[PDB]
Structure 1
Amino acid sequence: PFVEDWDLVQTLGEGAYGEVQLAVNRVTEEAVAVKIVDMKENIKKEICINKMLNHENVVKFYGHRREGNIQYLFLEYCSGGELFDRIEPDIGMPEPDAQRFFHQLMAGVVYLHGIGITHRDIKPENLLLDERDNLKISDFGLATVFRYNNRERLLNKMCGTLPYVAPELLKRREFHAEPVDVWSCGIVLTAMLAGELPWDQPSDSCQEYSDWKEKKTYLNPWKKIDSAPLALLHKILVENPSARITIPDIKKDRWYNKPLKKG
Structure 2
Amino acid sequence: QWALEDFEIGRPLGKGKFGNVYLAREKQSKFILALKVLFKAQLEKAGVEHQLRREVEIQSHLRHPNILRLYGYFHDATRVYLILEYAPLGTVYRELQKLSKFDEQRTATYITELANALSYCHSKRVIHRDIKPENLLLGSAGELKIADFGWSVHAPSSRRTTLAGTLDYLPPEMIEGRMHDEKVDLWSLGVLCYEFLVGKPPFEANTYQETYKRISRVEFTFPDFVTEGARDLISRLLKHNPSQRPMLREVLEHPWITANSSKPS
TM range (shorter): 0.7 to 0.9
Aligned-pair distance for 1:172? 5.1
Aligned-pair distance for 1:25? 2.9
With normalisation by structure 2, the TM-score equals: 0.83
Aligned-pair distance for 1:156? 3.5
The 3 A distance-change label for structure 1 pair 164 and 204 is closer
Residue identity in the other structure for 2:23: L
The 3 A distance-change label for structure 1 pair 195 and 90 is farther
What CA distance in whole angstroms lies between the structure 2 residues aligned with 1:237 and 1:127?
A: 20
* 2:114 equivalent to 1:101: no
The 3 A distance-change label for structure 1 pair 174 and 203 is farther
Normalized per residue, the structure richer in strand is: 1
- 94-103 vs 12-21, which moves further: 12-21
Count residues with an aligned counterpart.
246
The DSSP-based 3-state class of the residue aligned with 1:37 is strand
Map Cα deviations across residues 189-219 of structure 1 (whole Å, 9 max, x no partner).
111111111113796733996543xxx54xx
Name the counterpart of 2:185.
181
* 2:173 equivalent to 1:165: no
What CA distance in whole angstroms lies between the structure 1 residues aligned with 2:216 and 2:104?
A: 24
Normalized per residue, the structure richer in helix is: 2
What CA distance in whole angstroms lies between the structure 2 residues aligned with 1:91 and 1:38?
A: 34
Residue identity in the other structure for 2:257: Y
Residue identity in the other structure for 2:231: L
Aligned-pair distance for 1:93? 1.2
What CA distance in whole angstroms lies between the structure 2 residues aligned with 1:180 and 1:248?
A: 16
Name the counterpart of 2:231.
230
What CA distance in whole angstroms lies between the structure 2 residues aligned with 1:208 and 1:170?
A: 8
Aligned-pair distance for 1:37? 1.1
Map Cα deviations across residues 220-249 of structure 1 (whole Å, 9 max, x no partner).
3xx331211111001111111111122122
Unaligned runs of 5+ in 2: 42-48
Residue identity in the other structure for 2:18: Y
The DSSP-based 3-state class of the residue aligned with 2:201 is coil
The DSSP-based 3-state class of the residue aligned with 1:68 is coil
Unaligned runs of 5+ in 1: 147-152
* 2:67 equivalent to 1:67: no
Residue identity in the other structure for 2:95: R
Aligned-pair distance for 1:108? 1.0
Confirm or deny: 8 A CA contact 2:24 2:32 kept in the other structure. Answer: yes
Residue identity in the other structure for 2:55: E
Name the counterpart of 1:77.
86
Residue identity in the other structure for 1:180: V
What CA distance in whole angstroms lies between the structure 2 residues aligned with 1:126 and 1:246?
A: 23
Name the counterpart of 2:53.
44
Name the counterpart of 2:213.
205
Aligned-pair distance for 1:135? 0.5
Residue identity in the other structure for 2:56: I
Aligned ranges 1:136-151 → 2 under 5 Å:
136-146=145-155
What value does the CA root-mean-square deviation take over the aligned residues?
2.5
Name the counterpart of 1:150.
none
What CA distance in whole angstroms lies between the structure 1 residues aligned with 2:218 and 2:59?
A: 38
Instruction: List structure 1 segments (4+ residues) > 6 angstroms apart after TM superposition.
Output: 201-204
What CA distance in whole angstroms lies between the structure 1 residues aligned with 2:199 and 2:75?
A: 40
Aligned ranges 1:250-261 → 2 under 5 Å:
250-259=251-260
Residue identity in the other structure for 1:69: T
The DSSP-based 3-state class of the residue aligned with 2:182 is helix
What CA distance in whole angstroms lies between the structure 2 residues aligned with 1:207 and 1:185?
A: 14
The 3 A distance-change label for structure 1 pair 8 and 130 is same
Aligned-pair distance for 1:154? 3.2
Aligned-pair distance for 1:64? 0.8
What CA distance in whole angstroms lies between the structure 1 residues aligned with 2:40 and 2:212?
A: 39
